[PDB]
Write an enzyme that holds these catalytic residues in place. Structure first.
Site, PDB file in Angstrom:
ATOM      1  N   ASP A  35       1.623  32.426 -37.640  1.00 16.79           N
ATOM      2  CA  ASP A  35       1.487  33.392 -38.721  1.00 16.79           C
ATOM      3  C   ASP A  35       1.465  34.795 -38.137  1.00 16.79           C
ATOM      4  OD1 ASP A  35      -0.913  32.910 -37.492  1.00 16.79           O
ATOM      5  OD2 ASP A  35      -2.141  33.068 -39.302  1.00 16.79           O
ATOM      6  N   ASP A  40       0.709  10.317  -0.254  1.00 20.36           N
ATOM      7  CA  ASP A  40       0.072   9.652  -1.391  1.00 20.36           C
ATOM      8  C   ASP A  40      -1.349  10.174  -1.565  1.00 20.36           C
ATOM      9  OD1 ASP A  40      -0.537   7.394  -3.393  1.00 20.36           O
ATOM     10  OD2 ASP A  40       1.445   6.813  -2.654  1.00 20.36           O
ATOM     11  N   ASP A 100      -5.902  29.261 -39.765  1.00 23.13           N
ATOM     12  CA  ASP A 100      -7.270  29.602 -39.417  1.00 23.13           C
ATOM     13  C   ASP A 100      -8.224  29.495 -40.595  1.00 23.13           C
ATOM     14  OD1 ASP A 100      -6.978  32.378 -40.765  1.00 23.13           O
ATOM     15  OD2 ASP A 100      -5.457  32.445 -39.184  1.00 23.13           O
ATOM     16  N   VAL A 141       0.830  -1.210   0.000  1.00 23.03           N
ATOM     17  CA  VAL A 141       0.000   0.000   0.000  1.00 23.03           C
ATOM     18  C   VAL A 141       0.860   1.255   0.000  1.00 23.03           C
ATOM     19  CG1 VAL A 141      -2.132   0.952   0.904  1.00 23.03           C
ATOM     20  CG2 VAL A 141      -1.599  -1.351   1.358  1.00 23.03           C
ATOM     21  N   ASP A 164      -6.930  25.200 -44.571  1.00 20.37           N
ATOM     22  CA  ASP A 164      -5.791  24.912 -43.711  1.00 20.37           C
ATOM     23  C   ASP A 164      -6.018  23.688 -42.833  1.00 20.37           C
ATOM     24  OD1 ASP A 164      -4.457  27.060 -44.758  1.00 20.37           O
ATOM     25  OD2 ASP A 164      -4.860  28.406 -43.071  1.00 20.37           O
TER      26      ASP A 164
HETATM   27 CA   LIG Z   1       0.901   4.454  -1.849  1.00 27.63          CA
END
Ligand SMILES: [Ca+2]
Length: 857
Positions: A311, A697, A600, A264, A604
């Site tokens: 551009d 954790d 744009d 764990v 394109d």
């Molecule tokens: Ca862990």
């Protein structure tokens, strides 16, 4: 739906196509539980192994450890689904403000509602790139190139026409309606919506970084589970008491508890949670930075953009030009603002053609609608000698060329003073090669070599000043009102030349310099004359020394073998084409060098699709946005650099958070293993290790993933194309972090051994948890210390650290010391030694960071 057989007028009569709210509520509007998502989010392999560990730890009839692990699973699950709900709300917002807006003519009322609030029976105009949201009958259209790759997979561009389909229904090649879910590749879509989104035919029908990190998680899980198998084998066969082993049948449970708690602790359950949380907060940061990202898998690679192909128009220019200098064949300086009368003939002719060929107008102040060049020209006319736009309404507009992309001859004809005045604007070289008369007062005589040389001299003089410039012409035959055609286009006189400066957006210079310092080579495409764009690039800051620039004509007339050699030293493309856009994006992609296109326009879109992280402009067409991975709302180039900085910050948050988690887990692992090798009582019991995995954790790791940008994110080379989570520098940081913190725990265990094994267990546990909570400080960056970056500058980190300190404050309470293997009561020294060791650990960690800042790089 009985609309295939009807013509235009028949659709008007039958469906009552021309109260609007009545039709909206009558025809209908044209627009997952969170607990179900929580149920379906158990697919994470770390969550799976932890839940099987939790259920076995429940089945031996031990309660508190079971609640601890189950609490870990529920906190990471709820934080994952809460930030998933935040991401869903953000995505709904992005779909709301950047919704496809269809310009609706309605009952003659020209407006534009969004896609959701449409209603059948109203006229909708579709320009090029205006993605049609609802199906409907079309009456007239000029070459309406409509692709249907999403509605029915029809890749061909079907041209809708007036023709209807009586007594037949088919979703294939048909011209009667413009169906929903279709993109206007070309044409003018003047149609009337006939379908609710429910009745529309299309209505009837993770990231690569995430995949790589789950692969790394599965590899670490296999290795870690093998490690706990080895640990359980050590507790089994290393001592085993004697031959009888006393009560080994009822004593394997604690050894399996130790091995399971090791699993764990070592397993990063919040790996996918951290990744999803920082991607959601990164996307929110992009939204704050005027960058609406469409493709979710594009967040990780935005930190790896070693090249960007932008551009100048739109991004590197806020439009609304101001012409600063002009050329006249007679030759003088600026004389327009002072001149009350017509002044010289060249100046007055230039002013009248500039006003007349101007399609746009100033209208009310602060309201510009037309092309930026025409807006600039009319603003110049109205800036000098007060009002000049009023002269246009006393000038008829007879013949206007529609300004074809291969023409550059936007024309104008008036009958006020001159009968058939052939008045046109265009590019400098095109008029120079097309017009064939010089304007010196009343003289209209053709070009010679010295005259043409002087025109070219002023043209390149304006060009190297980064000034785009347009040429004008007046000469015409008398004739009469013509058919608005070209007629005689080889006899035009040459009126003076006006050169307009192209101003970059604010902080473009700073963003360009910080991108060039970051190794992000920038590339700018343009469609005007070449050396004008070269001087623009010199002004911007992407041109220095050995860099070169090649036009589109040289781009498509050069094989890729030498273009690959030339590609790394060129940043300006002029007269470029979407095929050349495909060429440059593929050439940049070939040598790694993750690309971000900028197109744009409607066509394109192939360049945007082949681009890894191609971005379409918010002011651009919607089909480009569909082809784009991300969108800038403010359209500025600074949004691109801020976007790649946010991507780098997000990947650095991945690196730092995984570094913190794996380093703490490795410190615990080496502490347990060092207790194992020296025939010692293990430093942490099952519940202690599970409470450490509860404290860390978790929310502290989430907060460390919420860390802001360190001052050197734009000072590093871009990340490689691969993810590279286990980078050599960050692996050195991980191993030093974990080895140090494990050394602190080992020393605390040894000091506790001088008193008692229970004292050793308690002191090792508190040393590890305090060192984790305080190493959250030191792991805020690999460059800046906790004091150097400021403790309160990372509000999430300090808040989470206080949270885990309070949670660890359960240990000092006497009611929880029995379950945590904390014996007796402390005067000072059951806590002071651990606190001093943890403080020495983090201060050692910090001076290691400073030494890496001072001695190393
Ligand atoms: Ca862990």
């Amino acid at each position: 739906a009985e609309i295939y057989r009807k013509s235009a007028a028949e659709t008007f009569t039958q469906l009552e196509a021309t109260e609007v709210t009545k039709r909206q509520e009558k025809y209908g509007f044209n627009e997952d539980p969170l607990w179900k998502l929580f149920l379906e989010t158990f697919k994470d392999p770390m969550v799976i192994v932890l839940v099987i560990a939790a259920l076995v730890q429940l089945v031996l009839g031990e309660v508190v450890e079971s609640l601890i692990i189950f609490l870990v699973l529920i906190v990471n699950s709820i934080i994952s689904v809460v930030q998933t709900r935040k991401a869903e709300s953000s995505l709904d917002a992005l779909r709301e403000m950047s919704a496809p807006v269809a310009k609706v003519i309605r009952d003659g009322s020209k407006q534009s509602i969004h896609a959701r609030e449409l209603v059948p029976g109203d006229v909708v105009i579709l320009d090029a790139g205006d993605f049609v949201p609802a199906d409907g009958r079309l009456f007239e259209s000029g070459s309406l190139k409509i692709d249907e790759g999403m509605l029915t997979g029809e890749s061909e561009a079907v041209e809708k026409y007036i023709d209807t389909i009586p007594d037949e229904v088919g979703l294939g090649d048909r011209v009667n309606m413009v169906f929903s879910g279709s993109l206007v590749v070309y044409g003018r879509g003047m149609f009337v919506v006939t379908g609710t989104a429910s009745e529309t035919e299309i209505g009837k029908i993770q990231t690569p970084l995430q995949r790589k990190l789950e692969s790394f998680s599965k590899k670490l899980g296999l290795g870690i589970l093998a490690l706990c198998v080895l640990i359980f084998a050590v507790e089994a066969g290393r001592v085993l008491l004697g031959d009888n082993s006393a009560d080994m049948a009822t004593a394997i449970l604690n050894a399996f508890m130790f091995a399971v708690a090791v699993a764990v602790a070592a397993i990063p359950e919040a790996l996918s949670s951290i990744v999803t949380i920082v991607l959601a907060v990164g996307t929110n940061k992009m939204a704050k930075q005027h960058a609406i990202i469409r493709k979710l898998p594009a967040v990780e690679t935005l930190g790896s953009t070693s090249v960007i192909c932008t551009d100048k128009t739109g991004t590197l220019t806020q439009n609304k030009m101001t012409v600063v200098d002009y050329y006249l064949p007679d030759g003088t300086k600026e004389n327009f603002p002072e001149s009350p009368e017509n002044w010289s003939e060249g100046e007055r002719r230039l002013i009248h053609i500039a006003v007349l060929c101007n399609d746009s107008n100033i209208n009310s102040e602060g309201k510009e609608l037309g092309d930026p060049t025409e807006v600039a020209l009319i603003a110049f006319s109205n800036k000098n000698n007060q009002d000049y736009n009023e002269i246009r309404e006393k000038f008829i507009r007879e013949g206007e060329i529609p300004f074809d992309s291969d023409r550059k001859l936007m024309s104008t004809l008036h009958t006020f003073n001159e009968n058939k005045a052939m008045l046109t604007k265009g590019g400098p070289d095109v008029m120079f090669a097309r017009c064939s008369y010089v304007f010196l007062d009343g003289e209209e005589k053709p070009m010679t070599e010295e005259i043409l040389a002087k025109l070219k001299e002023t043209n390149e003089e304006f060009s190297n000043q980064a000034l785009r410039v347009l040429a004008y012409g007046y000469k015409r035959m008398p004739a009469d009102t013509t058919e608005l055609k070209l007629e005689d286009e080889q006899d035009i006189v040459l009126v003076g030349l006006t050169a307009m400066i192209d101003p970059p957006r604010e902080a473009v210079y700073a963003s360009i310099e910080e991108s060039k310092k970051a190794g992000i080579r920038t590339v700018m495409i343009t469609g005007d004359h070449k050396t004008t764009a070269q001087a623009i690039g010199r002004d911007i800051g992407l041109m220095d020394a050995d860099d070169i620039a090649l036009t589109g004509q040289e781009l498509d007339a050069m094989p890729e073998e030498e273009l690959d050699k030339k590609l790394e030293h060129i940043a300006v493309y002029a007269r470029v084409s979407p095929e050349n856009k495909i060429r440059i994006v593929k050439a940049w992609q070939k040598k790694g060098k993750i690309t971000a296109m900028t197109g744009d326009g409607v066509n394109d879109a192939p360049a945007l699709k082949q681009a890894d992280i191609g971005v379409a402009m918010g002011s651009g067409t919607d089909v480009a946005k569909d082809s784009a991975a991300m969108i800038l709302t403010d359209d500025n180039f600074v949004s691109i650099v801020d976007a790649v900085g946010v991507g780098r910050t997000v990947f650095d948050n991945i690196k730092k958070s995984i570094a913190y988690l794996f380093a703490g887990n490795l410190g615990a692992i080496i502490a347990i293993l060092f207790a194992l090798v020296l025939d010692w009582i293990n430093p942490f019991t099952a519940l202690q290790l599970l409470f450490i995995n509860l404290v860390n954790d978790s929310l502290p790791a989430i907060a460390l993933g919420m860390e802001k940008a360190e001052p050197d994110v734009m000072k590093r080379k871009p990340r490689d194309i691969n993810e590279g989570i286990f980078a050599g520098g960050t692996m050195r940081a991980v191993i030093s972090r974990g080895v140090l913190i494990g050394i602190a725990v080992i020393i605390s265990q040894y000091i506790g051994m001088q008193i008692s094994p229970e004292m050793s267990v308690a002191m090792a546990f508190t040393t590890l948890i305090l060192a984790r909570t305080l190493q959250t400080f030191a792991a805020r960056s690999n460059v800046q210390t906790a004091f150097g970056a400021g403790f309160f500058s990372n509000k999430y980190v300090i808040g989470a650290v206080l949270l885990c300190f309070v949670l660890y404050g359960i240990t000092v309470l006497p009611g929880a010391r029995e379950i945590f293997s904390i014996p007796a009561s402390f005067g000072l020294h059951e806590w002071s030694i651990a606190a001093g060791l943890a403080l020495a650990a983090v201060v050692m960690m910090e001076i290691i960071k400073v030494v890496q800042n001072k001695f190393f790089k």
